[PDB]
Design a binder for this molecule. Structure first.
Ligand SMILES: Nc1ncnc2c1ncn2[C@@H]1O[C@H](COP(=O)(O)OP(=O)(O)O)[C@@H](O)[C@H]1O
Ligand SMILES: [Mg+2]
Length: 304
């Protein structure tokens, strides 16, 4: 299916080092955008992405870049957007920032398009789930949960997880607001979209899966050592799955969906017609350069 990788370099916070000269972002070159990281010991690293957002690029500017993507979920597509990176790099800000976030923007633009489509005779019914995966166990944020797949109807649900009907842009916003560990867990906001055209009888089923990933950094008590092993293996698994789905021979490959809760849960949104987008968030601070490079490698591997 379709996979795209955007890199976002966030701007320095007030108390952080302010110098970005170690990061060089080329203008978009007609077919990838490149960035290079220089570390002075002088080592150069280069990476290619579908798009690179600079410290000056706003949430609203970025959403214009994913708008067609998330809109395609009313067109019968399953869509996954992931935000990946080191703790502090801007994952949650990108996805959740109030009124600005990919999640708030997508929800708004969804209701607008939905309302819009009544003119064509379309009636859409929407539900959301919001869950978090911590140590490969599932927590329902809208409150035992198991993942149940129907291979014939290509669909998925989690047992005993509240699924709330979505009414207004206002009403949806309250659910989010209402709902360190979070730095260590994956948070997954899902929007189930079913529609039918009153005049035509035409049916539409689509999905949005918006994911704020556990932080990717690698550690150096044993409850923490285990936790950090789950996280690292969960992230690797996600990377292996996306990479394998991208190969030209993918239909001939084993895809290890079953190796983590996130990939198992999302399997039918990762496959077939599905569209996937991954943000790599990176901090500007040269003090974090090695974690930054790990992040960049992870995402480029997936991209390739
Ligand atoms: N693009 C951005 N513009 C302004 N502030 C940002 C941006 N990205 C992150 N921040 C801020 O930097 C800090 C870390 O971001 P956060 O979203 O918590 O990181 P993560 O989710 O990757 O752990 C927060 O204080 C957040 O408000
Ligand atoms: Mg966070």
């Amino acid at each position: 299916g379709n996979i795209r990788v955007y890199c976002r370099v966030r701007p320095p916070l007030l108390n952080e080092p302010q110098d970005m000269s170690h990061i060089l972002i080329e203008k978009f070159n007609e077919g990838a955008q490149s960035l290079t990281i220089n570390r002075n010991e002088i080592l150069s690293y280069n990476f290619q992405f579908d798009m690179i957002f600079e410290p000056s690029h706003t949430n609203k500017e970025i959403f214009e870049e994913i708008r067609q993507l998330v809109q395609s979920s009313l067109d019968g597509y399953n869509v996954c957007i992931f935000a990946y990176g080191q703790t502090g790099s801007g994952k949650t800000y990108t996805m959740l920032n109030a009124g600005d976030g990919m999640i708030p923007m997508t929800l708004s633009h969804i209701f607008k398009w939905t309302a819009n489509l009544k003119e064509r005779g379309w009636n859409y019914e929407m539900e959301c789930e919001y869950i978090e995966i911590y140590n490969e166990t599932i927590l329902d944020l809208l409150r035992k949960h198991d993942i149940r797949h129907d291979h014939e109807k290509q669909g998925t649900y989690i047992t005993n997880v509240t699924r709330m009907k979505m009414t207004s842009t206002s009403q949806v916003d309250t659910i989010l607001k209402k709902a360190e560990r979070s730095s260590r867990s994956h948070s997954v906001f899902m929007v189930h979209i079913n529609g039918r055209n009153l005049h035509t009888g035409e049916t539409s089923q689509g999905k949005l899966n918006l994911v704020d990933l556990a932080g990717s950094e690698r550690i150096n008590t044993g409850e923490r050592l285990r936790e950090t092993q789950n996280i690292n293996k969960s992230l690797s698994c996600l990377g292996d799955v996306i990479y394998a789905l991208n190969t030209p021979d993918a239909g001939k490959r084993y895809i290890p969906f079953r190796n983590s809760k996130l990939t198992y849960l999302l399997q039918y949104s990762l496959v077939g017609d599905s569209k996937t987008l991954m943000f790599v968030n990176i901090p500007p601070d040269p003090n974090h350069i090695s974690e930054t490079l790990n992040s960049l490698r992870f995402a480029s591997k997936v991209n390739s």
